[PDB]
């Protein structure tokens, strides 16, 4: 199995199965859990993983609500109903990116065009800057011309900037020229095509990385 | 789910149900709860969550009034009816925004670009930066689309860069759209047009400032 992904805003209420018998795990991709709170006498054990997760065991059988608070300022609520079975692992995506004060300092110390190139290289080369963290991709962040459909893949976000990758499929099978300017939306700060492209064949599975601003809208 | 958002004026009173069985949360975004008051015995436990917010549990069965005070001086009141269910989370908002922080442009241009821009502005006004002593202009700088005759007027020479001014003659009788990159010559850093271009007509004499490197051939 791959860990299941919850993706909740910073008030989220997700009902998820939990196991009475074996330990269960919750991790934040980009944040360190600092505390888990449940009703007294409900969660039998609670230990913090080094990576930044939390492992917990519940012995009771009633459905209950648990609250998780991450260090960089975050709170998510899950209602956990205990069922018989294996331990479950859930990955918690923020949906609303966290404020990262220590990242703004790196972000603003350099020039704008240099920063754009750096984020774009990192996404392309697969190494992520230290200050950035993983977030849920935006449902609609780019304009869709010529009857296209877009499937988001991954997104990352810092303090004033936010990167996402979108898979574009050409559905009209007739040849469509590609211009970064035609995908521009209020808030889209930069667009790069991973393959040089300039053209899109009739069946196209290509990708595009867009940098935007955090908090636009 | 998403936290229930409630907008209240100071001293505002909102009737929201809470839960007897599970912990409940109230957070004001951008604000830290500094105090909470409830009728005595109504609230079993009160803790401060990360990034403000209060976590509270009630064993009560009667509707009661909770007063919450934030650190920015805002006080709100909530009437809470305890009912069986999942812990409920509420997002507190202020009906009237107290202040409007002015926008901050954090983007910084590159050093080369700023240097050309500063000089172009200085030349346009005519004040001379230190180290610029004036010099004879060349004839090398301008390529002519056609119908244009160039006469040098003024020129400055410094330690790193060089600027000059040429006035083009009126073109013949066809309107000649003016393209700033249609007067390019190898070696020129930046070319800018006085006034607004947009087609010099059956005539017109427009001064153009051309910027070129200094010392380098």
């Amino acid at each position: 199995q791959s860990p299941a992904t919850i993706s909740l805003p910073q008030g989220g209420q997700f009902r998820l199965s939990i196991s009475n018998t074996d330990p269960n795990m919750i991790f934040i991709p980009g944040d360190k859990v600092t505390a888990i709170t449940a009703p007294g006498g409900m969660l039998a054990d609670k230990r913090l993983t080094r990576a930044g997760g939390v492992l917990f065991t519940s012995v009771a059988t009633r459905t209950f609500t648990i609250f998780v608070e991450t260090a960089r300022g975050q709170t998510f609520s899950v209602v956990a109903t205990p069922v018989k079975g294996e331990g479950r692992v859930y990955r918690l995506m923020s949906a609303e990116p966290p404020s990262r004060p220590e990242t703004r300092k790196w972000e603003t110390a350099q020039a704008y065009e240099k920063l754009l190139i750096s984020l774009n290289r990192a996404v392309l080369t697969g190494d992520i800057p230290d200050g950035y963290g993983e977030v849920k991709p935006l449902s609609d962040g780019i304009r869709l011309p010529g009857g296209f459909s877009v499937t988001p893949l991954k997104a990352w976000a810092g303090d004033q900037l936010r990167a996402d990758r979108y898979e574009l499929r050409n559905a009209n099978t007739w040849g469509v020229a590609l211009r970064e300017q035609d995908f521009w939306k209020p808030g889209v700060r930069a667009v790069m095509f991973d393959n040089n492209a300039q053209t899109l064949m009739g069946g196209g599975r290509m990708t595009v990385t867009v940098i935007r601003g955090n908090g636009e809208g | 789910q998403s936290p229930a958002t409630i907008s209240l004026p100071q001293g505002g009173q909102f009737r929201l149900s809470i839960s007897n069985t599970d912990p409940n949360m109230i957070f004001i975004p951008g604000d830290k709860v500094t105090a909470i008051t409830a009728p005595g015995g109504m609230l079993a436990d009160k803790r401060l969550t990360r990034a403000g917010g209060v976590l509270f549990t009630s064993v009560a069965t009667r509707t009661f009034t909770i007063f919450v005070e934030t650190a920015r001086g805002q006080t709100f009141s909530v009437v809470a009816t305890p009912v069986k269910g999942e812990g409920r989370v509420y997002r507190l908002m202020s009906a009237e925004p107290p202040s409007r922080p002015e926008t901050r442009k954090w983007e910084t241009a590159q050093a080369y670009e700023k240097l050309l821009i500063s000089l172009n502005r200085a030349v346009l006004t005519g004040d001379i930066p230190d180290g610029y002593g004036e010099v004879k202009p060349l004839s090398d700088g301008i390529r002519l689309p056609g119908g244009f005759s160039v006469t040098p007027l003024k020129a400055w020479a410094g330690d790193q860069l060089r600027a000059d001014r040429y006035e083009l003659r009126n073109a013949n009788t066809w309107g000649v759209a003016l393209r700033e990159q249609d007067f390019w010559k190898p070696g020129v850093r930046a070319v800018m047009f006085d006034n607004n271009a947009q087609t010099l007509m059956g005539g017109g004499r427009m001064t153009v400032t051309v910027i070129r490197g200094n010392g380098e051939g």
């Binding site: 859990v33 709170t37 409900m42 | 912990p23 436990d45 803790r47 549990t57």
Partner: peptide
Amino acid sequence: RPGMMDSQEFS
């Protein structure tokens, strides 16, 4: 133990 919740603050 009435109303008390388990609030573990991790260091």
